[PDB]
């Protein structure tokens, strides 16, 4: 038996369904958003959305609709799960406590039935007399509501039409009357039936069947004033009320199909219509005195590709997208001078369809960092995910363009710095920051007329302020300046540096040493360098006498973070760096062990060193790239030790854990400057400035995933990391219409350089495919190689083959022509990225689609249509076949560990292949003979094979222990509820064995890891206890939810622990824990579950 622990690293982000109504209260306007298993309840405030409750369903929310039965105060919620768990939910808030009580529930899955093509429809009678569910072909399930059930007893009415596209309940009808579009051989027609709950059968509808457009796919029930329905097809919008037949063919809706709609008004005079391109239309019903006069369609603008859209109020429209980020837009009354009325207010991150992903230890830390091909046609993008630190934004004040922050103890007695200084362009503005209050009040001795490069508290009970003109040492208690020094030529200081005792300030190409004496400023040392100063640091660290011994310098035109002996300004060391960019900050600090130096260039590169106190010679040069903006480094002292902060586009805390330098991310957008502050009202806090305002807060141990977004504007398909070249190779796909024309500027069309495939092998709208080389620091498209006409790039591996040392981008393609169902032609192209160009090093015409390539022990293992063959890289640099394997329907997925090859098939599901090198051929070791349609596969151990079937299930196969030894044994079964597109070894963090991430279509990132037998037994026990204690929203059983489910099989879960349910063991009060832990003590299990949460 296998022992696996599944947990959610990132909850699903794709909005599969959204409704609005009065759910939390009769006066609240709620936005209920269904992300695959999460129901998110918001309150529609005058601005944005205020989250109120987020619950986890034990089901994929297939249907989600609000209805108000007679007498009810506020809307009840009907949810149907993909496994057909129906429930009616009511929201009951008792002060602080919030509950979602199940007013009714059931399971409406018919034992048998052909699940309808178009998918689970759930409608509710506008008068709440029944819930109509179309789940299967030829049947229409009715759940009465007037018969107030608690079990949702439902009955089928046999529907004489077997291919129903869409169906709605009509308005203003004495009987529940459905209107549906169905497809028969004679075309598509719209028909109506009246539902008799007493006779439990249909009756003749109000207006007979009508022959409608060929591609009619949408029915819109129109409220009572008009009644009738509006059927949207590809080329027409037609309105039916029984005798009235309005019909329009707005040319603007011909370009794309309309897939979602929403009624803006209560009276249906306006509808939103979202298309698969992301356009947003407004469908207007002009009334005449009431009947309907005419239909109009107007293009409001563009949004994200909407799966569902809901109109909230005051022009605010929530565009819920499965393919891109969900949106909160505004509809302006007037156009934007670009023809668009849509204006995005807010964007909700959606790791869209994660079609591929890789774990790269970027920034050369010990931390993994996901890079995912997220999104689709217009919403495609690369998302970079990492675990990141967060703080609270307590004290904000919006002063544009800060260029300075320093902590000052204006109260001389206290060692707390109760005053904050800021320089902006040419002056200094101070802040009292008294208490939590913040206002600008002036402390004597500092000038409001000059920029300030530095100020702070210094020894002898003195303050110091270094300006663009000259230095000012104020005596704190008595009065203003009694010591001033200025440059003899009165040249503005170009670079400064200072500590509590001494001062070091650069004047162009020469440097000046001053030291503080009480009510005096004494100059001692001077030097004339080759070129201008770039940055300094003189900080005394482990001082123990009163003065730092050493200094560091960066110079122009001789780029080098050099070292100086302080009393003499002499060269202790001179270490070059390279590049034409001046270093902009340099610092030395201690991390638990000794003095380090941290010098960075303007593009986020950063070198850490081991600095000696005697020689101060720079060695142990190693580099890390952090951000793209020039950087600055200021320390804050924590409880424990010095914790250096880096301020740029990606603010990063810098620190050492267990004598190992860590480069943590901070989850804030941008920080210009930082300074520690420990006020009476603020302990150990930070003071973080951006271009707009001064943000203030502390440091939080808890880590929140940080998601970067790189808009590609075209569907990414694959991604691999070539470390030697510092780039990502991404297979992208863009849709061109006409020869052809790009509908929008994609990332491929906007690369630095470009190329097109000129191959001698092969001689509406089309898909063009490119290979994008993307910089792994700036995530800019270094290069975009377009592939042949009608060539689909499917697979992409980065590797080095044979014995040559070059690392190659290897793309396996197929030639796609509409005249055929499976490509007959394709090729394996070998690229090399070097000198900013992508040369074609080799080619190989294969006779099928290359669905997958894995580098396999120095050799290329490709899977052409049904054959798995192994290629070798010859000294001539061409691919030469070594062995083939044919016993496959479609080798879609390939994995590797040693000599073993795991093949995920289109529908034979897994095959354990071995390359016996002694012979030079494959051997079918084991096979799983169950018909599972794979979506992805992975190798967990030498003998455990994770799989994902397209029915949202995970199974683990195991080579058993005669010819029954060629049978893989499915020892693990688990219903994930998500469609896995990719597995990958790795972890997002610095008890469990191994760690496999997976990315899904909904945007979930999960984590599978191996447990030991003892811990698995314990956790299974607690799983049962929590099931006995924790109560699910729709009263769904966890075991039923996690039971392996297929249309021709259903088994209980086994060998898999829902890490979500276990980790829920922390969010329950102590008495409930004791209920869990009846038969070791609780604190033991709290420790266990904490340690379990440590993995993600």
């Amino acid at each position: 038996m296998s022992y696996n622990y599944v947990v959610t690293a990132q909850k699903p982000t794709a909005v599969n369904g959204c409704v609005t109504g009065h759910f939390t209260s009769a006066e609240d306007l709620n936005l209920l958003i269904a992300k695959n298993t999460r129901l998110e309840i918001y309150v529609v405030t005058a601005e944005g959305l205020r989250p109120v409750k987020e619950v986890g369903m034990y089901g994929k929310i297939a249907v989600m609709e609000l209805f108000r039965p007679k007498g009810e105060s506020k809307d009840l919620l009907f949810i149907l799960t993909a496994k057909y768990n129906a429930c009616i939910l009511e929201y009951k808030q008792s002060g602080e406590s919030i509950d979602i009580i199940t007013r009714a529930h059931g399971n409406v899955q018919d034992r048998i039935g052909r699940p309808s093509e178009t998918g689970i429809i759930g409608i509710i009678d506008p008068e709440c007399r029944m819930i109509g569910l179309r789940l299967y072909d030829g049947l229409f399930k009715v759940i009465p509501l007037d018969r107030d059930n608690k079990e949702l007893k439902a009955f089928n009415i046999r529907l004489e039409e077997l291919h129903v596209i869409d169906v709605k309940f009509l308005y203003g009808c004495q009987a529940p009357t459905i209107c549906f579009v169905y497809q028969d051989p004679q075309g598509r027609h719209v028909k109506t039936y009246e539902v008799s709950l007493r006779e439990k059968e249909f009756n003749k509808g109000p207006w007979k069947q009508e022959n409608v457009e060929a591609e009619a796919s949408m029915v819109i029930a129109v409220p009572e004033p008009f009644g009738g329905a509006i059927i949207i097809g590809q080329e027409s919008i037609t309105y039916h009320n029984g005798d009235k037949y309005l019909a329009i063919a707005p040319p603007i809706i011909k370009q794309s199909t309309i897939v979602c709609h929403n009624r803006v008004d209560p009276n249906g005079s306006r509808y939103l219509l979202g298309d698969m391109e992301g356009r947003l239309f407004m469908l207007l019903l002009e009334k005449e005195e009431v009947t309907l006069k005419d239909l109009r369609v107007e293009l409001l603008g563009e949004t994200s590709i909407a799966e569902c859209l809901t109109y909230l109020d005051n022009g605010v429209v929530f565009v819920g997208s499965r393919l891109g980020d969900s949106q909160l837009v505004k509809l302006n009354v007037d156009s934007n001078e670009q023809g668009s009325y849509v204006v995005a207010m807010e964007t909700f991150t959606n790791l869209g369809p994660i079609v591929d992903m890789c774990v790269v230890d970027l920034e050369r830390q010990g931390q993994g960092q996901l890079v995912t091909c997220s999104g689709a046609f217009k919403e495609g993008s690369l998302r970079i995910i990492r675990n990141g630190i967060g703080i609270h934004e307590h004290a904000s004040i919006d002063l544009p363009g800060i260029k300075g922050l320093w902590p000052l103890r204006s109260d001389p007695n206290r060692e707390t710095d109760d005053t904050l200084v800021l320089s902006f362009v040419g002056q200094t503005r101070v802040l009292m920051l008294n208490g939590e209050e913040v206002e600008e009040t002036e402390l004597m001795g500092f000038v409001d007329d000059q920029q300030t490069f530095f100020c702070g508290n210094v020894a002898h009970q003195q303050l110091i302020q270094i300006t663009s003109a000259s230095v000012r040492l104020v005596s704190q208690e008595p009065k203003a300046l009694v010591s001033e020094w200025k440059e003899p030529q009165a040249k503005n200081i170009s670079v400064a540096s200072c500590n509590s005792s001494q001062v070091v300030v650069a004047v162009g190409r020469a440097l000046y040493y001053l030291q503080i004496h009480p009510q005096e400023l004494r100059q001692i040392s001077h030097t004339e360098m080759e070129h201008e100063v770039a940055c300094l640091d003189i900080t005394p660290l482990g001082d123990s006498n009163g003065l730092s011994p050493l200094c560091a310098i960066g110079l122009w035109t001789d780029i080098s973070a050099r070292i100086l002996k302080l009393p003499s300004f002499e060269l202790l060391h001179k270490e070059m760096l390279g590049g034409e960019i001046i270093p902009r900050s340099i610092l030395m600090t201690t991390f638990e062990s000794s003095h380090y130096l941290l010098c960075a260039l303007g593009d986020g590169a950063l070198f850490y060193f081991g600095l000696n106190i005697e020689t101060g010679l720079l060695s142990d040069r190693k580099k890390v790239t952090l951000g793209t903006q020039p950087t600055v480094l200021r320390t804050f002292r924590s409880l424990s030790t010095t914790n250096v902060f880096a301020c740029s586009d990606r603010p990063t805390v810098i620190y050492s854990s267990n004598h190992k330098l860590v480069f943590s991310n901070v989850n804030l957008k941008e920080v210009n400057y930082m300074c520690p502050l420990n006020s009476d009202g603020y302990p150990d806090s930070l003071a973080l400035a951006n271009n707009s305002t001064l943000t203030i807060g502390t440091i939080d141990e808890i880590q929140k995933l940080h998601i970067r977004t790189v808009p590609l504007y075209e569907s990414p398909r694959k991604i691999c990391y070539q470390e030697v070249s510092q780039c990502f190779g991404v297979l992208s796909s863009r849709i061109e219409v006409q020869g052809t024309t790009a509908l929008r500027p994609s990332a491929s069309t906007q690369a630095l350089s470009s190329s097109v495939s000129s191959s001698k092998l092969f001689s509406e709208e089309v898909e063009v495919h490119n290979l994008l080389i993307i910089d792994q620091h700036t995530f800019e498209v270094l290069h975009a190689h377009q592939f042949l006409q009608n060539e689909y790039a499917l697979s992409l591996v980065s590797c080095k083959l044979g014995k040559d040392p070059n690392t190659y981008f290897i793309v396996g393609t197929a030639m796609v022509y509409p005249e055929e169902a499976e490509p007959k032609q394709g090729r394996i192209v070998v690229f090399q990225y070097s000198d900013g160009k992508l040369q074609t090093v080799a080619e190989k015409e294969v006779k099928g689609a290359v669905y997958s390539m894995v580098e396999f022990n120095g050799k290329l293992l490709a899977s052409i249509n049904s054959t798995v063959r192994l290629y070798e890289w010859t000294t001539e640099k061409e691919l030469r076949t070594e062995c083939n394997h044919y016993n496959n329907i479609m080798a879609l997925y390939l994995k590797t560990k040693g000599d073993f090859i795991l093949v995920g098939d289109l529908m034979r599901s897994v095959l354990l292949l071995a390359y016996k090198p002694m012979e030079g051929n494959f051997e079918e070791i084991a096979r799983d003979f169950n018909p599972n349609w794979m979506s992805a596969v992975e190798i967990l151990d030498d003998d455990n094979f994770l799989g994902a079937e397209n029915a949202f299930n995970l199974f683990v196969c195991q080579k058993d222990s005669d010819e029954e030894r060629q049978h893989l044994q499915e020892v693990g079964l688990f219903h994930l509820g998500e469609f896995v597109n990719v597995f990958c070894h790795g972890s997002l963090v610095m008890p469990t064995q191994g760690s496999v991430l997976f990315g899904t279509v909904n945007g979930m990132i999960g984590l599978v890891t191996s447990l030991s037998e003892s811990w698995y037994n314990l956790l299974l026990d607690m799983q049962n206890r929590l099931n006995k204690v924790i109560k699910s929203v729709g009263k769904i059983e966890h075991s039923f939810w996690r039971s392996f489910h297929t249309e021709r099989k259903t088994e209980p879960a086994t060998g898999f622990i829902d890490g979500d349910l276990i980790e829920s063991f922390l969010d329950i009060s102590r008495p409930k824990m004791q209920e869990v832990v009846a038969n070791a003590t609780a604190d033991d299990l709290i420790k266990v579950v904490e340690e379990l949460t440590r993995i993600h």
């Binding site: 362009v425 503005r429 035109t557 034409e580 793209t628």
Partner: protein, 203 residues
């Protein structure tokens, strides 16, 4: 608390400083800042909405410097000994001043150009300017190709000419797409005919 400042002088001294710093670093005119004060000036007196017209400012100034480079290179001499040296030296001059203005306008990169991909880089704008006005669209193009065919062909018969000159010229070629668009062809075809004559001769 804290009455606001005035940004008026900040904006208007700026443009003149931009074009004199351009005027400084181009032609190697000397600077009274040691460039770090100028970098800080770029950093401070460039902000939101400042940078794009600032880019216009600087790129027209450097653009007219590039087009001032034109005139000694529209010529009737046919040295490939010396004219290509002049091209190479102009290339080096261009290189050092474009790297050095980036040593000033790296704030521009790490704010809008490295941090938004909407523009040719300073690299890219500089290369397009140099190419368009000195290398491409000229008799120089044909003359430099002919001359380097001479140099290599002379160096294909015995003698070494200047490994540095051939290396630097080929660098200019390949980076300006002038060794990968259509000027590989003159190289290869002269190789074809010459080496054919060589092979069937000493055969």
């Amino acid at each position: 608390r804290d009455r606001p400042r005035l940004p008026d002088n900040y904006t208007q001294d700026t443009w003149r400083k931009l074009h004199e710093a351009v005027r400084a670093v181009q032609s190697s005119t000397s600077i009274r800042y040691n460039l770090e004060e100028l970098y800080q000036a770029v950093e401070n007196l460039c902000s939101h909405k400042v940078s794009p017209m600032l880019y216009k400012q600087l790129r027209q100034a450097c653009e007219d410097h590039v087009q001032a480079q034109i005139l000694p290179f529209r010529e009737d001499s046919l040295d490939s000994v010396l004219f290509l040296k002049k091209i190479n030296t102009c290339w080096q001059d261009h290189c050092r001043q474009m790297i050095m203005i980036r040593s000033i306008f790296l704030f521009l990169d790490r704010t809008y150009v490295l941090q938004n991909s909407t523009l040719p880089s300073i690299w890219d704008m500089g290369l397009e300017l140099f190419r368009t006005h000195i290398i491409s669209d000229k008799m120089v193009q044909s003359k430099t190709i002919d001359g380097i065919l001479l140099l290599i062909e002379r160096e294909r018969s015995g003698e070494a000419v200047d490994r540095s000159l051939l290396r630097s010229l080929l660098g200019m070629l390949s980076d300006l797409q002038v060794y990968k668009d259509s000027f590989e062809l003159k190289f290869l075809e002269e190789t074809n005919c010459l080496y054919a004559a060589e092979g069937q001769r000493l055969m």
